[PDB]
Amino acid sequence: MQIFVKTLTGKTITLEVEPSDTIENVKAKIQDKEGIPPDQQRLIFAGKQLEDGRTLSDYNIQKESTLHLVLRLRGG
């Protein structure tokens, strides 16, 4: 199915995913399209940060869902 990701520049990309795809797998797909390394990605859906090891189905992410990408900050 198709979901939508709001990128760092505010533009919307389409991902091809299944309900059983892991957040790691979704991050790998954003990496292919945006060049953002998975360990630098934070994905927000319905005010929640999505966790690695869980799947899109666990958060009830259905087709035409929009995820929010937020780049990891390095604060020292």
Partner 1 sequence: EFHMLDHTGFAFPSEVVNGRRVLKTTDNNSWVNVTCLQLQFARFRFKSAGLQAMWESYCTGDVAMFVHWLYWLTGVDKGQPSDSENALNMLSKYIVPAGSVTIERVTHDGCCCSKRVVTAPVVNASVLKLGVEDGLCPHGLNYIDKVVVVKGTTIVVNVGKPVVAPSHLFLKGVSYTTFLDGHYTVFDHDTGMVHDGDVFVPGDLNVSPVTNVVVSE
Residue 48 CB, nearest approach to partner 1 (Å) = 7
Closest contact distance (angstroms) between CB of 16 and partner 1 is: 18
Tokens of 72: 């990891």
- Among residues 35 and 73, whose Cβ is nearest to partner 1? 73
Q: Which is nearer to partner 1, 20 or 71 (CB)?
A: 71
Residue ranges that bind partner 1, judged by CB under 8 A: 4, 6, 8, 10, 12, 42, 44, 46-49, 66, 68, 70-76
Please give the structure tokens belonging to residue 24.
């790691």
Question: Per the structure block, which two tokens stand in for 42?
Answer: 């934070």
Let me know the angle formed at the C-alpha of 44 by 42 and 49, rounded to the nearest 5 degrees. 70
What residue type is assigned to position 23 of the chain? I
